[model samples]
Target: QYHVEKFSGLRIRKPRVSSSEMERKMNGRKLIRLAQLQNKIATEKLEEEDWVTFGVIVKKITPTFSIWRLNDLKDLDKYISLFLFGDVHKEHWKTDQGTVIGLLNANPMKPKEGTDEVCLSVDNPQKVLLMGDAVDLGTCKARKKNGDPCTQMVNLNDCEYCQYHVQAQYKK
Candidate 1:
C-alpha cells in the first residue's frame, strides 16, 4: 500500500522518484529538467506510426485550416466513436457524465461548420496560435524550418497566415 501510494502520489504525492531509488538518483547529480517534466513524464513516446491518445481534455484555442488536419482529420471524427469507444456500454458514452468528447472546440469553426469532433488517429493534435479574424493581430505564426518567421502578408482578414503559409504552418 505504501509503495503504491509513493508511486501513485495519491496520499502525499511529490517527485515521481521513490524513496528507495531516489538515494542513488540524487548521487548522480543529474538534475531532471523540471520544466521539461511534461515531455519526460506526461508525453507518450509511441512506436513508429502506432498512434494512441486518450485524455479528458482537448485544447484547441486558435483554430486554423488544413487539407489533412482541418479538412480531413477532423473529418474522421465521425468514424472515431466507432474506433475509440463503439457501443461498449453505449448508454454511458451517450450521456453527459460518461461522454467521450474532450474537445474544447465546442465553439464555432470557420466556414459556417462546427462540431465538437472527437478522436483523431494521430500521435498528437496540432495546437498553435493559428488565428482567425484578427484586429490587433499581426504576423503569421508560421515559421521557416530555421526559426525565422515567414515573410509574407496575411492573406485573409480572418486568418493570420498568408496565402502560402496558410497551408504550411509547421503542419505534419
Candidate 2:
C-alpha cells in the first residue's frame, strides 16, 4: 500500500488561494483587536466569578508529580468531558497535540499566585508552555500487577499536586 523512496528537498506545496485568504485576513486587523479586547473582558469575568481555574497537567518529565489531564474531570460531570474533548473533535484546533487547552475552557487564565501571566480567549488560545515544576519521571513500558498490567492510566484523583496545584472549578 505504501513505499518509501529517497528524495531531495521533498516539500509539500501550499495552495495559491491561501495567499488571497492571508491578504483578506490581514485587512481585518481592527476587527481582530476588538475581538481581543472582548476576549480579555470575558476571561476576567470567568476568573472573578470562578468560571476559570488554573492548574498544571502533570507532564511526565521528572520524578515529582504525575501526569493528569482533562480526562480526569470525567468523574466531575459529562459536561466537563465534552468541554475538554469537544473542540479538537469538532472545532479546528492546533498545537500541543490538543493539549494546549486554552480555547475549550472559558479562556486562558493566570494563576493568581504564579508569576506567569496570560491573556484569555475562547476563540483562540495561546500555546501551552512549562510554567510549574511538576517534574515526575515515568517509563514508556507498562507496569504489571496481579499478573496483569496494573493500569495503563495515570492516577490523577489521589495526587495532591493535582488537587491543589492544579486549578479547576468544583460544582456548587
Candidate 3:
C-alpha cells in the first residue's frame, strides 16, 4: 500500500506544544507557542502574473485565451468572478464548464483591489482543462467493439474513450 500527501511547497519548523484533546472541548484553546511562525505565506499581495490556482473553469474558450469562473464562489457570484486565461492558441479548449466541483488541474491567481470589476488576464495554463466538461461528454473513442462510435463519457487521457472502451484498446 502507498499514500501520497500533497507537498504545499512551504515548510516551517515544528513548534513544541502539547495538550490532550479531551480537555480542548471545555478549556480555552490556547497554544504556548504562536503557530504564526508556521505561516509561510506572503503578507503582501503577489503580482498578477503570479496568480495561479485550479479551482476555476472556462466559461468561454478562444484561440489565444479563454474566460473562466471559479467553482468555489464563496464570496463571489459566477459572473462576478470571471477570469481570463492568458495563453495562446487554445481556442477550442473546452465545450463548457462542469457544474459539479472537484480539484481541477489548473493553478494560481491573485485577487484585485479598489475595483469590483477587476478580473485578471494572466498567462500559464493546463490545456485550459485538466478535466472534462458538459453533460453527454460525447462518447467513447477507443474504436469500440460491437458499438462502432460512442456518445459515452469518462474519457481516459486524450484517447477519448469510456472506461470499458479504454480497456478494450489494450491487446491481451
Candidate 4:
C-alpha cells in the first residue's frame, strides 16, 4: 500500500529500486512481469490496427479551405456513425467547424479541383541582412549624408572609420 501511494500522481502511477540477494531475485521477477505486460500491450495495439487506420490528418487554419485532423480511431468512429444517420456530418463539420466538406466517404481525399494550396501572404516585406565579411570588419558609427549609418567597413586599430573616412576625422 505504501509503495502504491508513493507512485500515484494526478492520473499516472508506477515504480523504483534497491538490492540484496533476496531483493535482487524479486526485482528480476518484476522485470519478467513487466516484459510480459509489454508483449500483451503490443498484441492489443496490433489488434486495434487491424480494424482501423491510425493517423492524424492535419487541417489547414484558413477560413477559406477545409481540412481537419482525425486524432484517433474513436474520433473516426463518431464521424462514421453521424455520417450514416445525421446530415451525413459533413454539413456540421463545414458550418460549425471550419472544415469545408460534404458527404463523408470511404476515402478522405477531395477531388483535384477542390485541392487548393495554402499560401502565406505578407503585407510588409523585410530584407535579410547578412553578416558577411564587410559587416564583420569594424567600421565607423557616423551618420551618412542620407542619415543612414556609414557603410565604410574598417579595422579599429587606427581610427574608428575606414581608410577614406579615417583621414577626414582622425588627428594628424
| Top candidate, metric lDDT | 3
- Candidate 2 has its poorest 10 consecutive residues by lDDT at 3-12
Best first by lDDT, ranked: 3, 1, 2, 4
Q: After superposition, how far is residue 154 of candidate 2 from its true place, in Å?
A: 4.6
Local accuracy of candidate 4 as per-residue lDDT tens digits, 64-161: 32334322111221111111112322232333221111111122222235423211111111100011111112446776778988865433333466
Per-residue lDDT for 23 in model 2?
43
User: Which residue pairs in candidate 1 have backbone atoms (N, alpha carbon, C) closer than 3 angstroms, thus clashing?
Assistant: 133-158
TM-score of 2: 0.24
Residue lDDT tens for model 3, 65-155? 5555443222122222334443422433443454322221122245457643324343444323232232222346655457667654431
Report the Cα RMSD per candidate: 17.3, 16.5, 16.8, 24.3
TM-score of each: 0.18, 0.24, 0.30, 0.19
Better of 1 and 2 by TM-score: 2
- Show the colliding residue pairs in model 2: 54-167, 55-167, 62-136, 62-137, 63-136, 63-137, 64-135, 64-136
lDDT, candidate 4, residue 6?
14
Give the C-alpha lDDT of model 1: 0.27
Model 2 lDDT per residue over 40-116, tens place: 55455433432222222322221212122332221221111112223322332222221312122344534436432
Best by TM-score: 3
Q: Rate the local accuracy (lDDT) of all candidates.
A: 0.27, 0.27, 0.33, 0.26
